[PDB]
């Protein structure tokens, strides 16, 4: 890992979170969760992100997100 490698991961992470958030605002719960799942997948320790998402999403939506990992 150089700076390019981490930078591409940070950028993907940020794009997916943004898409996740927009799609959910539009009520496409399924695709929004897919995007959030991609952002979670690239974090070695997603606990804090998950706690923030639990505070931000409706419970059944957060639930769903947990089943996908």
């Amino acid at each position: 890992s150089d700076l390019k490698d981490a930078e591409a991961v940070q950028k993907f992470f940020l794009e997916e979170i943004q898409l996740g958030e927009e799609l959910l605002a539009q009520g496409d719960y399924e695709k929004g969760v897919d995007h959030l799942t991609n952002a979670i997948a690239v974090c070695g320790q997603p606990q804090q992100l998950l706690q923030v998402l639990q505070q931000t999403l409706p419970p059944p939506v957060f639930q769903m997100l947990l089943t996908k990992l």
Binding site: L14, I17, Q18, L19, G20, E21, E22, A25, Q48, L49, V52, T56
Partner: peptide
């Protein structure tokens, strides 16, 4: 979209 990213940085 973006408020979620902002919220995540804050720490």
């Amino acid at each position: 979209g973006x408020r979620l990213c902002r919220l995540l940085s804050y720490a």
